[PDB]
């Protein structure tokens, strides 16, 4: 409800089908997420793969979010002053792909997923801006 207001904020402009605030530093778990999305089901294992030391493996093997197979388009998670990743869901059964942006603050990750046709650029700006705001607030 407190962190849910942040999810609501991320969703308010109509471009995202889901969003989430996800702890990674003190412990790895979802703090808040859109009900019924993949982010809600993100596991500690999946968080570890997002934040982990290995920044090359997920370009060969992909990764999952809430067990949904994804590819990594760009990794700047440990580029200071950026701290984002651009991800895209894999298409199964003829379905659209969706762009996902991740912004990393000090304690949490900001996840957003676009609706069909929503470009990664605006999504990245949204995750970055929220992550930056949280970082400047000590989170």
């Amino acid at each position: 409800a407190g962190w849910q207001s942040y999810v609501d904020n991320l969703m308010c402009d109509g471009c995202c089908q889901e969003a989430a605030i996800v702890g990674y530093c003190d412990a790895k778990y979802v703090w808040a997420a859109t009900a019924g999305g993949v982010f809600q089901s993100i596991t500690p294992v999946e968080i570890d793969m997002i934040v982990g030391k290995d920044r090359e493996g997920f370009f060969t093997n992909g990764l999952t979010l809430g067990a949904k197979k994804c590819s990594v388009i760009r990794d700047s998670l440990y580029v200071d002053g950026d701290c984002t990743m651009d991800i895209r869901t894999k298409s199964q059964g003829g379905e659209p792909t969706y762009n996902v942006a991740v912004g990393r603050a000090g304690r949490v990750l900001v996840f957003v997923m676009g609706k069909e046709g929503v470009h990664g650029g605006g999504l990245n700006k949204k995750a970055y801006s929220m992550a930056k705001y949280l970082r400047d607030s000590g989170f």
Partner: peptide, 13 residues
Amino acid sequence: GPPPPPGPPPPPG
């Protein structure tokens, strides 16, 4: 559950 947020999120666009 997690620590509460530091305050409200930024104003919506």
